[PDB]
């Protein structure tokens, strides 16, 4: 969906779109999608653009441009969501968390997890590293 982004990327993206829009229609050419992304720091090579128009005629409207930035931002955020989700598990932050620490903080997180689900969770996997916890979460 598009609720993954806050207000403040969307108000910035309409700021970039209405700056380089042609006549206020909400239209840009297949050149201007390149210059509107390099105006904000993001510098993709032309294969990254090459698939998104094939994904969406020559008329790139503002809901089409908003959906392409949402997929361009969510893939790196879905790859990096899980490390900061791992940070409250260990006290130091290198990735090493105790097994005795993990049965009161993971049964109390608010998804109605009982004592039985985290007991199945850790014995289908001392202290375990960080990259194994992605290996055991995504499965």
């Amino acid at each position: 969906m598009a609720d993954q982004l806050t207000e403040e990327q969307i108000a910035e993206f309409k700021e970039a779109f209405s700056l380089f829009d042609k006549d206020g229609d909400g239209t840009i050419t297949t050149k201007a999608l390149g210059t509107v992304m390099r105006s904000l720091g993001q510098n993709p090579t032309e294969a990254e653009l090459q698939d998104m128009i094939n994904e969406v005629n020559g008329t790139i409207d503002f809901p089409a441009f908003l959906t392409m930035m949402a997929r361009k931002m969510k893939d790196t955020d879905s790859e990096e969501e899980i490390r900061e989700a791992f940070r409250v598990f260990d006290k130091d932050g290198n990735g090493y968390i105790s097994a005795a620490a993990l049965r009161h903080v993971m049964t109390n997180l608010g998804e109605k997890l009982t004592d039985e689900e985290v007991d199945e969770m850790i014995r289908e996997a001392g202290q375990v590293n960080y990259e194994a916890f992605v290996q055991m979460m995504t499965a």
Binding site: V88, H104, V105, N108, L109, G110
Partner: peptide, 18 residues
Amino acid sequence: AAETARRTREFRSPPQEQ
């Protein structure tokens, strides 16, 4: 120790739950 278990809404649960 167990006081950490008591303080759970403060970091866990969605904001509406808090």
